[PDB]
Symmetry: C2
Subunit: 725 residues, 2 copies
């Protein structure tokens, strides 16, 4: 009873918005074959389903495909009151000034959402059987193949009377015209959705906020670059007084020789550019900048929440595509035991990566020995050439481990109770990112903190891996092994996700020229819509904030990523992807505590890279307290002679600050060593407590209503009292 026409067709042109009649909008398209006993069962599954639509009341043109096995389409349109009768269920704002549910006097975006709400709350009435989201599982399983809203026009060219809302975004927002142009941001919302709109509004905030972070990135770096003297440090290590006659203790006692400081100046010239004084000014700025980042975006919050609707209290209950019986009327004891085993299954998988970086460092010691043997064009050194292959090889292994994690990520989070349609990805963000947190930064977490420490009495350190040889560092603080590996993991991932992803259709763009309801042909967006695209930035947000005490060019690599990155996926949002339902969304949600969890962690580690890694607190102590007649022989504060008179002595000279032989407590931690490690641990305390106060002081002073939306919500309340009466 009450079925579709089942056959209706007159294409004429692919630029039609009505079926055949005129003055009818088109809301969704659906597809199914049924040209040829399982197909009989799926047919009466589909055929009886159409009565539920027209008993609610729709109009259903079934235009057949002309070419392939993927047969006849179905079109749909909601009439005016049928549109209006669910405009009172949801709370939508029509047109200056907009009001709830009843307005003055539309758009296909709001048309397409409520018809999906009209779609999704439907029944198959067998055993409280499938709704449209169950038919989405029949899109996954049964007769229907793709249900989606009809996209506007062909992406390249521009019917004449149609609004060209796509064509604006090609000429003003997509790639091949108007790259370095500002943002059409409000129109992105009006055509695509809201989580898409809040995505680019986040990115469009993020680039301009990074732009402030990058002009200080070169003000810091050129300050480390303009000094041709380098004052004292990294200048007496290769002076024409020899000065590299120091004969340091070798590593591993098998084939390394008693080497010299002649082989440090090619590195240490490129070290004074990185830790001199500006990185004190830079890392104290980055903690301020990330504090300014969240707050000024929270001011960018609650205005797009105000200038758009983003209404919270709507009637999304639950979807739950999984299958589950019920007798309890509220096994859940066994399901909670199922919870603590399945969440600990990844707690057993995260430990592989921290075991995998152990696999990296044990390669770094072994390949160093053959690298020390074959010894001008590029002054590589048995150290930085080892430090390159410590990065570029491991960066592959990060990329290999990341890609294989992605398949087993979704293979287990559907096993880890994928309930409550948005909690499924909300369980995914905490279990995918924590892999990426330890996949990316834990290699740098070794090089920062675990690497340079823990040597021994004749340099007999604690032998990790049983009796296997421990790890040794380089005078200079071993910071270069971070900032080379920092720009390799960041700069490599930037290439691996753009040049592997923008030149992949760029060659498809040039191979097309040289050498219809067609818009189902585009790729369907996955249910995880913007998830990897958010994850790509949060990891990029990690490197620019966790490890920017060294390498202050990290915003400059992030900018040239982002101004391309905001355009490459925006191009693939239009030219590549099927038109998604414009679902309304709040703030970022799953990532909003993760950006908060990074910023309160970035203040801790930026102090720890300055103190515990960067060899400047040993410089600043020696400059301020060991050039005086207590423990020095200079007139006033200078480092005139620091490297010859800070190393230890062996009965050879190694890097640490232990006592020389012939001391009443010889080869023990001397007066100087505890004096830097006071001022090391001092600097952690003041720089945390200042920035954690500036985090308090900025957030308390300047508000989140700022100046206009505190008025424009009251200029709104100025006129509902003009309309209440």
């Amino acid at each position: 009873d009450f079925r579709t026409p089942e056959f209706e067709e007159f294409n004429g042109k692919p630029d039609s918005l009505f079926f055949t009649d005129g003055q009818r909008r088109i809301d969704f398209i659906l597809v199914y074959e049924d040209e040829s006993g399982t197909n009989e069962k799926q047919k009466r599954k589909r055929q009886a389903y159409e009565s539920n639509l027209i008993c609610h009341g729709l109009q259903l043109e079934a235009t057949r495909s002309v070419s392939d096995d993927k047969l006849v389409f179905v079109k749909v349109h909601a009439p005016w009151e049928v549109l209006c009768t669910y405009a009172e269920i949801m709370h939508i704002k029509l047109p200056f000034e907009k009001s709830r549910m009843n307005d003055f006097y539309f758009n296909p975006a709001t048309r397409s959402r409520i018809v999906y709400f009209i779609l999704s709350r439907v029944k198959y009435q067998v055993m409280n059987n499938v709704n449209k989201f169950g038919i989405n599982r029949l899109v996954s399983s049964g007769i229907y193949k793709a249900a989606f809203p009809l996209h506007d026009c062909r992406f390249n060219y521009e019917d004449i009377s149609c609004p060209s809302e796509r064509y604006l975004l090609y000429r003003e927002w997509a790639h091949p015209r108007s790259i370095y142009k500002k943002q059409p941001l409000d129109l992105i919302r009006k055509y695509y959705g809201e989580k898409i709109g809040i995505y680019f509004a986040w990115l469009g905030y993020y680039t301009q906020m990074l732009l402030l972070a990058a002009v200080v990135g070169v003000a810091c770096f050129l300050y480390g670059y303009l000094d041709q003297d380098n004052c004292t440090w990294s200048k007496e290590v290769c002076d024409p007084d020899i000065g590299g006659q120091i004969l340091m203790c070798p590593q591993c006692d098998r084939l390394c020789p008693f080497w010299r400081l002649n082989i440090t100046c090619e590195s240490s010239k490129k070290l004074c550019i990185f830790d001199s004084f500006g990185t004190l000014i830079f890392a104290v700025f980055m903690g301020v900048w990330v504090t300014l980042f969240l707050e000024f975006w929270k001011r960018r919050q609650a205005e797009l929440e105000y200038e758009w609707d983003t209404v919270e209290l709507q009637q999304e209950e639950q979807a739950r595509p999984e299958y589950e019986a019920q007798c309890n009327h509220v096994t859940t004891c066994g399901k909670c035991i199922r919870v603590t085993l399945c969440a600990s299954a990844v707690f057993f998988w995260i430990l592989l990566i921290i075991a995998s970086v152990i696999g990296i460092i044990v390669y770094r010691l072994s390949v160093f020995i053959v690298f020390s043997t074959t010894l001008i064009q590029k002054y590589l050194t048995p150290q930085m050439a080892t430090s390159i292959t410590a990065s570029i090889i491991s960066f592959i292994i990060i990329m290999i481990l990341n890609t294989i994690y992605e398949k087993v990520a979704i293979m287990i989070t559907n096993f880890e109770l994928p309930r409550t349609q948005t909690d499924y990805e909300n369980s995914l963000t905490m279990k995918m990112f924590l892999f990426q947190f330890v996949n990316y930064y834990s290699s740098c977490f070794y090089i920062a903190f675990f690497k340079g420490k823990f040597v021994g009495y004749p340099g007999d350190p604690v032998y990790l891996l049983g009796k296997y040889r421990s790890e040794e560092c380089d005078p200079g603080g071993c910071l270069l092994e971070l900032t080379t590996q920092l720009t390799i993991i960041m700069g490599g991932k930037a290439i691996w996700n753009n040049i592997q992803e923008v030149l992949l259709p760029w060659v498809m763009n040039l191979i097309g020229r040289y050498k219809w309801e067609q818009d189902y042909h585009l790729q369907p967006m996955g249910k995880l819509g913007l998830f990897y695209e958010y994850l790509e930035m949060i990891i990029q947000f990690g490197f620019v904030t966790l490890f920017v005490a060294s390498f202050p060019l990290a915003p400059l690599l992030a900018l040239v990523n982002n101004i391309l990155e905001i355009r490459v996926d925006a191009w693939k949002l239009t030219t590549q992807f099927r038109r998604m339902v414009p679902e309304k969304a709040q703030d970022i949600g799953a990532w909003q505590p993760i950006m908060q969890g990074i910023a309160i962690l970035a203040v801790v580690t930026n102090a720890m890279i300055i103190a515990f890694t960067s060899d400047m607190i040993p410089r600043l102590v020696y400059y301020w307290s060991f050039s005086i007649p207590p423990y020095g022989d200079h007139t006033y504060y200078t480092m005139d002679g620091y490297i010859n008179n800070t190393l230890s002595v062996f009965n050879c000279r190694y890097r640490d600050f232990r006592n020389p032989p012939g001391h009443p407590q010889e080869y023990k931690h001397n007066i100087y060593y505890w004096h830097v490690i006071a001022a090391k641990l001092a600097f952690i305390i003041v720089m945390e407590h200042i920035i954690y106060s500036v985090k308090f002081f900025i957030s308390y002073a300047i508000p989140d209503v700022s100046k206009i939306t505190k008025s424009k919500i009251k200029r709104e309340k100025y006129l509902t009292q003009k309309l209440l009466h």
Copy 2:
């Protein structure tokens, strides 16, 4: 037109709820004299005002007083629809399950609030002239003297058919019956209000949370008390080997003698009970406990917000009793210059108290000299007897400075733009408490941090006050001068606000026995209702959390305050105070960031009292690293001989760890001194970062919906779908 009866009277009994007729509730009482040209102007001010009530519609009995100049009362009652017509303006819940504005099928508390809303939005129509809150200023200025809701009955004895809602609170909640009984908390809301109800629900949380903090207060303290040995420290200083033959350097070089360690054991026996090892366990518990304090009260939040209404979006716009013209249509430039001068006027007054503690310490040095002269029953010592009078005299000066601050507090916050009726006290809480923060704790902030440090080369320290003699400390860490002064300021203030305030009417209770609309006679509550009562606890919340690394009995003094304090003002809320309007309120509001501002500050200072004040990090370093053949002559880790071999030497022996004479850098900071100040500053870092992670880990793990209100708001949504249809 439409005036009151102006005279109606038939008392009969003081227990009447109607005027004379029967079946009429009574909502407010108002009073005014007018028995005797200014009185003529105030009469027609009052007389024309009554027409505005009955044009909205009320019933007005004017019963005359029988005794005094304070003449005729006025009674008022809202009829049913007159009650109901503003029950749609506000959003009130009538009766299980309650609903907005329209319900199944009352109470005088909800009756009295909306009639005050019916009162407060009224007009005198001269120049947009006074409302009832302007008549509240006419209560302050003109003819009316007291407008208030009628209290239920006489407080002592129990009409027979009346609900005895007062009489329950005398027999189950007030003082002289049922002290050590649990809380009737929901009925407090139903009779008094909501900010009153959220007050005792905060206190009733606060005592049970302190009870957990006090059973560890004696588990810590008895652990410092059960040890009769005291192991090593504070035992070799008076051994029968002399051991106090050390001849310490005297102070001030005028009359103090080269004294001995014979005079320390009466103090240092009472020091091992305070810093041994349990205060490590106690202060790491207090940071956990204050973290557990806020979160489990935030779980106590949003249930009383749920079990009562506490609705946010009601229509309280503004009162602004001050006077201000308007031409700008939105001098405000001069008002902002007025802001930065008036707020800096107290920034000029806060500096007096930190100058006043300078007045305290300069007394402590001068009175020490005459105290050292007159030298068994109580072994006082020229130090702790000086430390008593350093406290008990200064505690008076804290009490003197606090009471004189209160008058000049309100004398300036009405000068500091007292706009926006709740922002006035919200401006008061930030400007009154910051005085109390520096009035109370800044004396202890000296004794903790500024006191014991900064001595000199022959003990020639930096002479503060020009060439005036600097401050000296005591071997032992000078912790006793804190914890004596801690229990004096806390234990004295407990007496000064209870025994001065509960025995003040207790003698009035016994002088009554041995040796009617009457309920206007009680004291009117000030506009700052619970302000000083909140301030009394937050300061008490400070001492139990900021300075509890020493004196772990501070919860035990706080408990015996609070179980009395929750009953003494509750008695004075009933037996002393006029019945206030039951105004609805949110969470605590002005104090809620202040308790957050204490907890994130208490974690910082509890580390600083342990490391920088308590002499145990010098003990634990000597126990762990100076009893070995490096820098010691013992077999294994012990303090067998610590005080003779840790003090400095002068060509005499003083407290600091400088180099002995005959050293190549003599009288300089030795190898040991930088080794404790590493482990001092180390312990600040680990104990902050653990507790700031446990603050993160507890708040992330256990939620704020907990277990029942996440269901009972959804068990609510389970039944509006049963009622929507």
